[PDB]
Design a protein around this nucleic acid. Sequence first.
RNA 1: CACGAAUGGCGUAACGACUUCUCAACUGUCUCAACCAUAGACUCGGCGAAAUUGCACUACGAGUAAAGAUGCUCGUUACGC
RNA 2: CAGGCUGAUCUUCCCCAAGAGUCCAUAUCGACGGGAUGGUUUGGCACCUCGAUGUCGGCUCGUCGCAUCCUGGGGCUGGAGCAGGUCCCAAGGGUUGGGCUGUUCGCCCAUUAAAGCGGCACGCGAGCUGGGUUUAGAACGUCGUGAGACAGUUCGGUCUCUAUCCGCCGCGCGCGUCAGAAGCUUGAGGAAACCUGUCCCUAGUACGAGAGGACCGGGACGGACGAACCUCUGGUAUACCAGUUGUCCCACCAGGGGCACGGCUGGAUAGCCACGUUCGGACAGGAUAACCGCUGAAAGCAUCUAAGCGGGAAACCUCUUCCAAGACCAGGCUUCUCACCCUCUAGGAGGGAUAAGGCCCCCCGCAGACCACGGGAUUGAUAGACCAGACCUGGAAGCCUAGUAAUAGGUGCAGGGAACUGGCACUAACCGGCCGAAAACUUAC
Lengths: 122, 125, 118, 214, 113
Amino acid sequence: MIQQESRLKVADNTGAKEILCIRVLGGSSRRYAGIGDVIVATVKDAIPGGNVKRGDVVKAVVVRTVKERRRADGSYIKFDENAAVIIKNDNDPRGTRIFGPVGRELREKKFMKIVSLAPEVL
Amino acid sequence: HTGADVKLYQGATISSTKIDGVGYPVHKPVTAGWNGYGDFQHTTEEAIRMNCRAVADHLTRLVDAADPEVVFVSGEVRSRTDLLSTLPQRVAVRVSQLHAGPRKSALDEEEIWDLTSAEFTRRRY
Amino acid sequence: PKPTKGPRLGGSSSHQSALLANLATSLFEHGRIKTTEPKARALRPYAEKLITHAKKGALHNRREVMKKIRDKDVVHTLFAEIGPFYADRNGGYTRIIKVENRKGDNAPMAVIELVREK
Amino acid sequence: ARKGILGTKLGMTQVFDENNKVVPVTVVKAGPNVVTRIRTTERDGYSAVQLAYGEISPRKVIKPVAGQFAAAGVNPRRHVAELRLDDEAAVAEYEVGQELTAEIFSDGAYVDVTGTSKGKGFAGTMKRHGFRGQGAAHGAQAVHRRPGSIGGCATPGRVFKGTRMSGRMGNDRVTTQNLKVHKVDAENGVLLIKGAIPGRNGGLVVVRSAIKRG
Amino acid sequence: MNTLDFVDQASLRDDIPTFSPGDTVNVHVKVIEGSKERIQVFKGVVIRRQGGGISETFTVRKESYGVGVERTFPVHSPNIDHIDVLTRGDVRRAKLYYLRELRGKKAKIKEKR
RNA sequence: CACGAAUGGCGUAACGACUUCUCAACUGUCUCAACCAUAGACUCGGCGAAAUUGCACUACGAGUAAAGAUGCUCGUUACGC
RNA sequence: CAGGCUGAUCUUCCCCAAGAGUCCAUAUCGACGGGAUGGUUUGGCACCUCGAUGUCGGCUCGUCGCAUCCUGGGGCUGGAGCAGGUCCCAAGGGUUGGGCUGUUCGCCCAUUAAAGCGGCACGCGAGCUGGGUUUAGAACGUCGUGAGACAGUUCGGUCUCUAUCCGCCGCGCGCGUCAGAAGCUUGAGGAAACCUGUCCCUAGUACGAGAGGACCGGGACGGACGAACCUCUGGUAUACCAGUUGUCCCACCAGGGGCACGGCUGGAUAGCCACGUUCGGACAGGAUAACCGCUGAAAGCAUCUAAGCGGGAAACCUCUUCCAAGACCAGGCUUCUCACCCUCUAGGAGGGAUAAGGCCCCCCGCAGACCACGGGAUUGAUAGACCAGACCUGGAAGCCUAGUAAUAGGUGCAGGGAACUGGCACUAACCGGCCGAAAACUUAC
């Protein structure tokens, strides 16, 4: 449940703090983005001495959502905050460290490099 | 969108032409009439379109005659992208859009040379 | 019991609750009252669940009756007379009889009565 | 050829796969059926079979109905329906007095379930047709939920049969396609269809072999 | 009497312990990663329980690296191969949703004595 | 195109249910709607209007006509209330 | 302002071919001249309406044309492959969200298979708004001596109406279908639906110096839309459970009740629902459009054609779902009742009483505006009460103990409780009324 005009936190060490959602990729007139769904965002907050600068246009992936997500076995996963990780074209992280846990659905969507650096894959 | 003026360069000689417009009231006033009866929306759009058609016909004649390599167009966002949509594919492929000021100010040779040098560099590269 | 399906009976949700407690108080004092038919139909489940409390008469059941009918002369009659009387009957303590319509507004009226056949 | 049986809907429940996945299922009491009549081409001009299901007391059967059951030597049943066969070759598979059970269906097969939808009453344009409404603020004038324009002025001047309006919805006949039967219970005569079937609990449904994927 | 309870009977499971919301448990779950079956443990307070028979679920809450995680399972799910109840807590609610806005020393729950 | 010095010119702390632009918090304004109650609407008993009104057992299409036809032409459709 | 005639202007084409394209008019453009379609633009006329046809834009709801934006089928290419240009056939479905502007239009941002062009009083104000605009206020610039004016601007300013007729969406009553009824159906004729992407194998293959990179053929997973349903997840809950503030009352303590949005908070079974769960667009066949062909003369050659024979697409017909014999050609297969009296002057008709069957009254429903529909009616589990279970809340009252008190612990998975399930005739379905069955004749066998 992430759409246009929606703000997420960044779980990298790229220097970004808030991003605003712009578009949800995967088809025309798409509505929501869940865990493992790529988006297009813009940087709203940043650290003074970082790489990404305020006002950039970047791509990102969703790793945590407040909305519960149903799994194939009838179980559910829920967090307290929406978070995102900025990636590049090859679907690899731009940063080097990942903060906090991430969902297991990134394994299905072939985000093998993000899963390795994540402290916990719930 | 009240006319145009054109300069053709073939080396030593420079030719100048002033295209005039046939639709005079190119400005749409806020007033329309009694309760909106009567309205200068369409009767001004048609005047602007007449001016654009005249300029496009003259420029197409010049392109067919002299065969230029580049046609720099200096105007504003409105009356530079609607004239580009009027020109045929023959000339619209060889159009470079400029960002210069009003026609009342007029331009000098040095200013035009400096405006076009940046494009000619890439063209020769 | 089962909540009212449509709009409430007196005009609001709080006038119906006070209307049913007054109707049950007058049913246990005279034993037979004549009301409008939809008012008697909705009273049958309500009044019968108070006699059941009086059948298993304790201090706990008494204090749950006292929170509805509020009349101390009717609480005594429920536990002294109407409780022991129905000690050999498993439900169905009330009967409804349909009578002639009202002249003023043609409302269907009915009589609700306590069973005395045993 | 094509298989079918008359049954009743019991409810929805939940079972787990052999791969630890969960599958929602609908429980259908595919009760026993008895063949009452066979529709031959010579008598009727088409090919079908007539099945009866249910249980009705002999006091509750109308006399003309009880004479049709007595003409086949079969006890009266509450419900009578028909299953249509595509040719005369499948007619030989049935005869009057047969006893159809739920075992005719095997696990993993695909079925079509036909039932009568729940009734929704007199419904407006949003509920019945999905008309997006109109703004709830910015100065609306009591048009928050009602349709709007219904045609073009003076040409034609009529309202074009088929215009979508308010009325009674629901309570129609619906056929769900390509449902997958999960498990058949022989000792209970109960099918476990994976999905949702039309109707309310205790209503009559018809479970027939799938026409597309079967 | 749950008209369909004659169908749900076969799929029920034994050896589930008797736990209540407020109790701290760790749940052993099975995960598949390249057809290699292993087991993961989720430890946290049990905050609710929505009884329905075979369709009963419960919710466990944890804090991970400063981020809380809630995970909900069906009680009779074959994936849960083991549940260990570690502590019995003192609560006055049947659902502990009020813990969602509490962090740190404010989210500790008393235990039976 | 077509400011200008008491029909004053340029600024100004405080003030304004005045006009314009932006930010934070907030939210059914929106994505995208869902449910509950009351007063009408609906049914029964009583009393009981109004504007309007050349007519009447007052269909549709393509045409014709004072140039946009329930009322004319040719067809199509249509059991009575 | 709208409609009407015209088509100068506008729009869509076409005839001739100077040239551009290295050579080469016609792969792709095409000057000077010429011929037209359409009725979207600016105009010309003043034919209906001034005892009234409310103007632009936005919203909600649509329907039609093809001069086709995507998807489908082909010819040519200055088409190596991927990707393109132009032309021919094709209207089944689809055609995004934002920034600026009252703005239609337009530029830009992020995507997409694509972000098509037009008609319907430039569709739609007895359906909604009132941002622009010319009622009345005030101010700026220019004009005027002035009252004031302006195809230059700025801040403001009441949107009335109980649907008679046609039209459209749903639902009943009456009669008919040649005796009165009841089950199950055939279908002439109609309605709905039709969208599309990424990845993997063939294959890093054909093609290409290389970079790049396929057709045809299989498989996996999605985006938008639609339908059914409530097991899971979430939303709501005005007769459910618990805490608590103010005040009044039940004589008082204890325990509760009335009012304060259900006073406010924490939850919440059933019902309804989406944000939830399942399913769908198909496979196959027929006649074709552009296009490709076989045999072959008139015309000793050549030619898809004049005789004959074939391939060929999301368009058309069957195929999927739904309605359907008021389909007046008013259908079919069966099963029930299959018989009584009186009067007119007995020609025919009228009347009463019945059979099978139906309706009203009564008890109800997840069926419902009313009606209708479905179920039950003592040879009875239809509704309520009663008992038990599931489920919600969360540990009732009384008593005892510990603490000076606020409070805590035991008795005790306690007490309370509606919708779901199973038992039980305890209460109500009653010692009851109204409708409802046949002229025959001709020919054939």
